[PDB]
Amino acid sequence: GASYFTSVDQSSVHTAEVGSHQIEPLKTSVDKPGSKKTQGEKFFLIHSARWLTTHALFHEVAKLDVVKLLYNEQFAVQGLLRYHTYARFGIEIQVQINPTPFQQGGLICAMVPGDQSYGSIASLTVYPHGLLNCNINNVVRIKVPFIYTRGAYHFKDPQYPVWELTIRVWSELNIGTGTSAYTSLNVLARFTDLELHGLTPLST
Amino acid sequence: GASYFTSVDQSSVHTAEVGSHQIEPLKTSVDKPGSKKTQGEKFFLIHSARW
Amino acid sequence: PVGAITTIEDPVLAKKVPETFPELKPGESRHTSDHMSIYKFMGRSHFLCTFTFNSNNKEYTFPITLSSTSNPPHGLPSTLRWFFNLFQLYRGPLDLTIIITGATDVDGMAWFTPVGLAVDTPWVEKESALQIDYKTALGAVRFNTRRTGNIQIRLPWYSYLYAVSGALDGLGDKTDSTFGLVSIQIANYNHSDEYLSFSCYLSVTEQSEFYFPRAPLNSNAMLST
Amino acid sequence: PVGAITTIEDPVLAKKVPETFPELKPGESRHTSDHMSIYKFMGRSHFLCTFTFNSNNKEYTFPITLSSTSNPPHGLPSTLRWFFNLFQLYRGPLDLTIIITGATDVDGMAWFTPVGLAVDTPWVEKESALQIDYKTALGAVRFNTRRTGNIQIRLPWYSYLYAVSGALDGLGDKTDSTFGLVSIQIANYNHSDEYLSFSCYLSVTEQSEFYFPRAPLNSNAMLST
Amino acid sequence: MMRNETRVSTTENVVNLSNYEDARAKMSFALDQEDWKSDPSQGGGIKITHFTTWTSIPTLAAQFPFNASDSVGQQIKVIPVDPYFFQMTNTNPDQKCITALASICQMFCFWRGDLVFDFQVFPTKYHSGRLLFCFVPGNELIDVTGITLKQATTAPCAVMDIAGVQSTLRFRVPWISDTPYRVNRYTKEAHQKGEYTAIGKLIVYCYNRLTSPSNVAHHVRVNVYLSAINLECFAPLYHAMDVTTQ
Amino acid sequence: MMRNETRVSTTENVVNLSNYEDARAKMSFALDQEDWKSDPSQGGGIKITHFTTWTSIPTLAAQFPFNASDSVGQQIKVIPVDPYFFQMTNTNPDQKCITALASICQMFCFWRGDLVFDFQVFPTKYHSGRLLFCFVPGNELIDVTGITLKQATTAPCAVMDIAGVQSTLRFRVPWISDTPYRVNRYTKEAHQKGEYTAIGKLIVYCYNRLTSPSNVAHHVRVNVYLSAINLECFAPLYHAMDVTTQ
Amino acid sequence: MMRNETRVSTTENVVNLSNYEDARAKMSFALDQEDWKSDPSQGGGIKITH
């Protein structure tokens, strides 16, 4: 007797079993056997847009509900969230781009909890941020624990987004006549210390 | 560096992090946190007919 | 001078202590306490709201909401507003202090009503619609203008949430953005008398906590009554 | 999971600690005191009754009766009612606190009268019919609306019984269902003045005891003024 | 020279009854200001001091019948998971039979802990059947009718063989919520997304159709007791929870 | 015989909220007058307690362009030296983007310490140029336009090679004043000789003209972050510092 | 700096004679607030107390 789903039986009897767990002398697969971490605490490509010469300063290149985005069949983690009601966790975001050295400018990526409200765009550095500069780096990583008003996030029917990742133009992207006037961008996200609670058959 | 999905970056930089894992002084849920066993090695009702 | 040059894009290098020119130790300040210690600062109970009674045997119920949305007077004003937006999560009791202005010999009562419970319609002066029994039950306080003219009682951290916040959107901004509500009901106020005004101020307590720093409200957001 | 199955009809087996699914220790609460400790709970003096004087030099005498029968206002209301029916026997002093509303410069007196003794007719405002000597003798207290506006004095466990109860029938429900009576007599109240109202609230003391748990009053019984 | 000056602080002669520290009397009627000892004489020594005393005594919350006519996977009864629940009632004398657990928590704004649903079967040693009890984590208002008995197995649940020497199954619903405590919203006019009273709903499915001969009832009744363990309530309030007409 | 006499001091029932010693409540609503422990559960352990937290985080105060068209010794940008500075602003949503450092000190009457101007260059590994940052000690209102790049070298300053593997120059302006602290005069109607808010002005000269090929921008933008170290503020006040339109 | 603040509790200037703790005088007419010894002189030592 253990685990969930208990069974109470009056006219009981013993269990019949044969053989035991056989450990492969020659494994049929070398990858770590699926585990909470294997399928849940791994990276996934959330969103991906473009950044042009047209994009003026402070232009929001992307406003994402990191969490909500992950909750989608497209990603394996869904398989763990799709069957649990609540869940608390931490997040690690990784945003990367590929500007040609002939390009110049910069972007700022900040993990703002809940909503940007009316916070001064100029102080987005206060939040867990990552500054991108063409002449310097083309990638940034951010990791944050659980920050919410509630003790967990409700997937099936959320109250308010846990994280709203924002990406604005920190310094207009200008170039010399001839150079590509753009640069695609991608956003990677993953759960950390994924704590799942309450198994449910629901879906919405 | 670990887990699946590896990333090779030329113009690399360090990772920015804030705070650390906070263990609930008063848990918001008493059930074992989801694990391979929690959601996979449990019982389910397959089929059901009459005799 | 090594801290005069660095790559701010790198989270590590950006923490390098800056130093450009040769300086000497600033020294000692002439005043005892540090005015930048949130606890000591907000320790100075700041302004919250104010209202005026018109008819007799009526009541006013104002909520304590961090909502950056709710613009005053029907919302957080001045300092209080500014402060409760410098961070994401708040929790802990709050030492409220309300000042009475005008009238006299007016008997009054006040009770704190936790978030998510029955309570007279917010920001509105009307005849209470609650069982005297219900009111009292939540813990109340009676007083008389003549004898006093001011009340300083602490407000409890009684909420089903782990914390509350101001910066939010519609939904959550309607539930997880409130500490609780206060309700003041007057009695024996023949308007043939002077007007009755109330001033409410809030001060942070030692048992109050503040989590995760946000980007302060842009000047255009900072309003005042 | 053994406590997931048992025979409730058996008094012993029914005490088997229930357990169905695997759980972890809840942890620690964030608030100091336990709100479920009767003493601390009822420690919050709850509402009892209220009345209003009409003519001068008159008096009101309200009894403190647990009787579930006596419906308010002429009886135990709200919380107080509910509480004093969760158990069968009660005994011990009670910290009464009465609030005055309205009038001013009105001299007043109040005395506790033990069960089974002479006392002005209950729940009725009339001209007292007791020797000032008699009144005082039982231990009294004088006060003036102007100077105060509220009184907090303890009520003694002075009764010829071992305990009192609310849930009773006719007879006993008319003798063993009372703690005692309170009487407030005003003086110098020219009605040309404002009205005079009194609010009485009761709080349980540490010297108060509660014996044998009863089945709480069904919702339909819980009334409120 | 007498010199004992003290400034008159704010809240002059203000009264507060939110707690005992201020509710306690400032003087006494008792002669010589005496006190009282303890006395369990006619109290059998049963001195009460905590409300736990009630919130731990399984009281009858509801009764539901299990007819043979009920087919496999058919929902027999649905109950929200919050102490404030109870549906028992008697015609005359007219009364809404509230439960112990309920009558207590009804006086609080918040609560938390493991609610316990005790199911008592009233069959005859000749019937035979099984009922699956499934707890769906959530809030007191989630359409659940669209859940196959199969789908139900995903969530935590327990089946029970009615026909037996035993008669009661104890269902301990673990505290599962996105919030530390739930609120007694049953006082508010309407409902609000987030302000919930229950941590989910409980379901009673028909695992195995009820079989039996012919000289025995064509069904079997079941009493549902409710109590709580590891219970915690705070934030006093007044309200006589009405009946939850399922 | 009871004999406890105390004289009623002055300021009877007077209220004061200038500090906590008098602002703290004299009673409580909390039942049994309980209290609360700490709880970083959903706070990631990031418990704030000091405003330093903000006044140390470099926030974007202003942006200025360095065009090749700018000749040697030409003043590119002038900025007063006081935390209350910031000129960043976004059209719609309409907002005057104040800085962390600013938004904090804006609530004080006085301040002192070393302000830190961080300059971030957004060039391409193909440009090449130098900008001289010069701090002229004084007050927020001193005609500085009449200062040759040469003259500027007399005062403390620093030059920077834009084209490089690095991207940020940190300018730590030492606290230099005839007074122990400066005042937030930005609240007063006008200005008064002596009542100053800044300890001087900062200048951005064009040390070496910006060179480059032709397949790269004809200029290079520069973000100017502002923060402070060894900062000290006192004398609480309210005022939402407006934008310093340079 | 003198800082001795005390809040005015309920029952302001209220009188209670139910017991001695509150019935006892708060001041005295006796000069120098003196007191008195015992004296069974003309009492034959028969001092009553109960």
CSV table of C-alpha atoms in Angstrom, one decimal, chain D residues 3-218:
chain,number,residue,atom,x,y,z
D,3,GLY,CA,-6.9,4.5,8.5
D,4,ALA,CA,-8.7,4.7,5.1
D,5,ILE,CA,-11.1,1.9,6.3
D,6,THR,CA,-12.9,1.4,9.6
D,7,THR,CA,-16.1,0.6,11.4
D,8,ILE,CA,-17.4,3.9,12.7
D,9,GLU,CA,-20.1,2.2,14.8
D,10,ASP,CA,-17.4,0.9,17.1
D,11,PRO,CA,-16.3,3.8,19.4
D,12,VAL,CA,-12.7,2.5,19.5
D,13,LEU,CA,-12.1,1.9,15.8
D,14,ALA,CA,-13.6,5.3,15.0
D,15,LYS,CA,-10.7,7.0,16.8
D,16,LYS,CA,-8.2,5.4,14.4
D,17,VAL,CA,-6.3,8.3,12.8
D,18,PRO,CA,-7.6,8.7,9.2
D,19,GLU,CA,-5.1,8.6,6.3
D,20,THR,CA,-5.9,8.1,2.7
D,21,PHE,CA,-3.2,9.7,0.5
D,22,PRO,CA,0.5,10.5,1.1
D,23,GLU,CA,0.9,14.0,2.6
D,24,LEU,CA,3.7,16.2,4.0
D,25,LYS,CA,3.8,18.1,7.3
D,26,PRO,CA,1.8,21.4,6.9
D,27,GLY,CA,4.5,23.4,8.6
D,28,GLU,CA,4.3,26.6,10.6
D,29,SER,CA,1.6,29.3,10.6
D,30,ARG,CA,2.6,32.9,10.1
D,31,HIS,CA,0.5,34.4,12.9
D,32,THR,CA,1.5,34.2,16.6
D,33,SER,CA,-1.6,33.2,18.5
D,34,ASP,CA,-4.1,30.4,17.7
D,35,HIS,CA,-7.5,31.9,16.8
D,36,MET,CA,-9.3,28.7,17.8
D,37,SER,CA,-8.5,28.9,21.6
D,38,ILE,CA,-11.9,29.7,23.0
D,39,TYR,CA,-10.3,31.9,25.6
D,40,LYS,CA,-8.5,34.0,23.0
D,41,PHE,CA,-11.4,33.9,20.6
D,42,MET,CA,-14.3,35.0,22.9
D,43,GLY,CA,-11.5,37.1,24.4
D,44,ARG,CA,-12.8,39.5,21.7
D,45,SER,CA,-15.8,40.9,23.7
D,46,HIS,CA,-18.8,40.2,21.4
D,47,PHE,CA,-22.1,42.0,21.1
D,48,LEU,CA,-24.8,41.4,23.6
D,49,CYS,CA,-27.6,44.0,23.5
D,50,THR,CA,-28.6,47.6,23.2
D,51,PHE,CA,-31.3,50.0,24.5
D,52,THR,CA,-32.3,53.6,24.5
D,53,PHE,CA,-33.6,55.9,27.3
D,54,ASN,CA,-36.6,58.1,26.6
D,55,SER,CA,-37.6,59.9,29.8
D,56,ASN,CA,-35.4,61.2,32.7
D,57,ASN,CA,-34.7,59.5,36.0
D,58,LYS,CA,-35.6,56.1,34.6
D,59,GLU,CA,-33.8,52.7,34.5
D,60,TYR,CA,-33.3,49.6,32.4
D,61,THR,CA,-32.5,46.1,33.7
D,62,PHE,CA,-31.4,43.5,31.2
D,63,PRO,CA,-30.6,39.9,32.3
D,64,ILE,CA,-27.7,37.8,31.1
D,65,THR,CA,-29.4,34.6,30.1
D,66,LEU,CA,-28.0,31.7,28.1
D,67,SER,CA,-31.5,30.6,27.2
D,68,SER,CA,-31.6,29.5,23.6
D,69,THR,CA,-35.3,30.0,23.9
D,70,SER,CA,-35.2,33.8,24.7
D,71,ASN,CA,-35.0,35.3,21.2
D,72,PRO,CA,-33.3,38.7,20.8
D,73,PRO,CA,-33.4,41.5,21.3
D,74,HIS,CA,-34.9,40.1,24.5
D,75,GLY,CA,-32.2,37.4,24.6
D,76,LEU,CA,-28.8,36.2,23.5
D,77,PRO,CA,-27.9,37.5,20.0
D,78,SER,CA,-25.3,36.8,17.4
D,79,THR,CA,-22.0,35.2,18.4
D,80,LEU,CA,-22.8,35.2,22.2
D,81,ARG,CA,-25.9,33.1,21.4
D,82,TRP,CA,-24.1,30.7,19.2
D,83,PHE,CA,-21.2,30.2,21.6
D,84,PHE,CA,-23.2,29.6,24.8
D,85,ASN,CA,-24.8,26.6,23.2
D,86,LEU,CA,-21.7,24.7,22.1
D,87,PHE,CA,-21.5,23.3,25.6
D,88,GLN,CA,-23.8,22.3,28.4
D,89,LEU,CA,-22.4,24.0,31.5
D,90,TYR,CA,-20.9,27.4,32.1
D,91,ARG,CA,-19.5,29.2,35.2
D,92,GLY,CA,-17.0,31.9,35.9
D,93,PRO,CA,-16.8,35.7,35.8
D,94,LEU,CA,-17.4,37.7,32.6
D,95,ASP,CA,-15.7,41.0,31.6
D,96,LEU,CA,-18.6,43.1,30.5
D,97,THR,CA,-18.0,46.4,28.6
D,98,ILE,CA,-20.7,48.8,27.9
D,99,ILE,CA,-20.5,51.7,25.4
D,100,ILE,CA,-22.5,54.9,25.8
D,101,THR,CA,-23.9,56.7,22.7
D,102,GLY,CA,-25.4,60.2,22.3
D,103,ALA,CA,-26.3,62.3,25.3
D,104,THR,CA,-23.8,64.1,27.5
D,105,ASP,CA,-23.4,65.3,31.1
D,106,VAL,CA,-25.8,62.5,32.1
D,107,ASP,CA,-25.0,61.0,35.5
D,108,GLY,CA,-25.4,57.3,35.6
D,109,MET,CA,-25.2,54.2,37.8
D,110,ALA,CA,-25.0,50.5,37.3
D,111,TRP,CA,-25.1,47.4,39.5
D,112,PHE,CA,-24.9,43.6,39.1
D,113,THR,CA,-27.8,41.7,40.6
D,114,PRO,CA,-27.3,37.9,41.3
D,115,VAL,CA,-29.9,35.4,40.1
D,116,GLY,CA,-32.8,34.8,42.5
D,117,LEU,CA,-32.9,38.2,44.1
D,118,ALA,CA,-35.0,41.4,44.0
D,119,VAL,CA,-34.4,43.4,40.8
D,120,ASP,CA,-36.4,45.8,38.6
D,121,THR,CA,-38.5,44.1,35.9
D,122,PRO,CA,-36.3,42.8,33.0
D,123,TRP,CA,-36.0,44.1,29.5
D,124,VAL,CA,-38.1,47.2,30.5
D,125,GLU,CA,-37.5,50.9,30.9
D,126,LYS,CA,-39.3,52.2,33.9
D,127,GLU,CA,-38.8,54.2,37.1
D,128,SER,CA,-36.7,52.1,39.4
D,129,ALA,CA,-38.6,50.5,42.3
D,130,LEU,CA,-35.6,49.8,44.5
D,131,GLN,CA,-34.2,51.4,47.7
D,132,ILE,CA,-31.1,53.4,46.7
D,133,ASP,CA,-29.7,51.6,49.7
D,134,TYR,CA,-30.4,48.2,48.2
D,135,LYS,CA,-29.0,49.1,44.8
D,136,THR,CA,-25.7,50.3,46.1
D,137,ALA,CA,-25.3,47.5,48.6
D,138,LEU,CA,-25.0,44.9,45.7
D,139,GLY,CA,-21.9,46.8,44.6
D,140,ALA,CA,-22.5,49.6,42.1
D,141,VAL,CA,-20.7,52.1,39.9
D,142,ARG,CA,-21.4,55.8,39.0
D,143,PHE,CA,-20.2,57.5,35.9
D,144,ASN,CA,-20.9,60.5,33.6
D,145,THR,CA,-21.3,60.5,29.9
D,146,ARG,CA,-19.2,63.7,29.4
D,147,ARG,CA,-16.1,62.4,31.3
D,148,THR,CA,-16.2,58.9,29.8
D,149,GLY,CA,-18.6,57.2,27.4
D,150,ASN,CA,-17.7,53.6,28.1
D,151,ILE,CA,-17.4,51.2,31.0
D,152,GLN,CA,-15.4,48.0,31.5
D,153,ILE,CA,-16.1,46.2,34.7
D,154,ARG,CA,-16.1,42.4,35.5
D,155,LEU,CA,-19.2,40.4,36.4
D,156,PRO,CA,-18.9,38.0,39.4
D,157,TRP,CA,-19.7,34.3,39.5
D,158,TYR,CA,-22.3,34.9,42.3
D,159,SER,CA,-25.0,32.2,42.0
D,160,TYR,CA,-26.4,29.4,44.1
D,161,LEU,CA,-25.8,27.0,41.2
D,162,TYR,CA,-22.7,25.1,40.2
D,163,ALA,CA,-23.2,26.2,36.6
D,164,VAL,CA,-25.7,27.7,34.2
D,165,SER,CA,-26.9,26.6,30.7
D,166,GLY,CA,-28.8,27.8,27.6
D,167,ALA,CA,-30.2,24.6,26.2
D,168,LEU,CA,-33.0,23.8,28.7
D,169,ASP,CA,-36.8,23.4,29.0
D,170,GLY,CA,-39.4,25.7,30.5
D,171,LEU,CA,-38.8,25.3,34.3
D,172,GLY,CA,-35.0,25.0,34.6
D,173,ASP,CA,-34.7,27.2,31.6
D,174,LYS,CA,-36.2,29.9,33.9
D,175,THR,CA,-33.7,29.5,36.8
D,176,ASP,CA,-30.6,27.7,35.9
D,177,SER,CA,-30.2,29.6,32.6
D,178,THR,CA,-29.0,32.9,34.0
D,179,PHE,CA,-25.6,34.4,35.1
D,180,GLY,CA,-27.2,37.5,36.6
D,181,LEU,CA,-28.6,40.9,35.8
D,182,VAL,CA,-27.3,44.3,35.0
D,183,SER,CA,-29.1,47.5,35.7
D,184,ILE,CA,-28.3,51.0,34.4
D,185,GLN,CA,-30.1,54.0,35.9
D,186,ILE,CA,-29.7,57.5,34.4
D,187,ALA,CA,-30.1,60.9,36.0
D,188,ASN,CA,-30.2,64.4,34.8
D,189,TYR,CA,-31.3,63.7,31.2
D,190,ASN,CA,-33.6,66.6,30.1
D,191,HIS,CA,-34.9,64.9,26.9
D,192,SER,CA,-34.6,68.4,25.4
D,193,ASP,CA,-31.2,66.9,24.8
D,194,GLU,CA,-30.1,64.2,22.3
D,195,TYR,CA,-31.1,60.6,22.7
D,196,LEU,CA,-29.3,58.2,25.0
D,197,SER,CA,-28.2,54.8,23.8
D,198,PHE,CA,-26.3,52.0,25.4
D,199,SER,CA,-24.4,49.1,23.9
D,200,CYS,CA,-23.4,46.1,25.9
D,201,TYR,CA,-20.7,43.6,25.0
D,202,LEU,CA,-19.4,40.5,26.8
D,203,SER,CA,-16.0,38.9,26.9
D,204,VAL,CA,-15.0,35.6,28.5
D,205,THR,CA,-12.4,35.6,31.2
D,206,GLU,CA,-9.5,33.3,32.1
D,207,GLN,CA,-11.5,32.3,35.2
D,208,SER,CA,-14.4,31.2,33.0
D,209,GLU,CA,-14.9,27.5,32.3
D,210,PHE,CA,-16.8,25.5,29.8
D,211,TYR,CA,-18.1,21.9,30.3
D,212,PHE,CA,-19.4,19.2,28.0
D,213,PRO,CA,-19.8,19.9,24.3
D,214,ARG,CA,-23.2,20.0,22.8
D,215,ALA,CA,-24.3,19.9,19.2
D,216,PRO,CA,-24.2,23.5,17.8
D,217,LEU,CA,-27.5,25.3,17.2
D,218,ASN,CA,-28.9,24.5,13.7
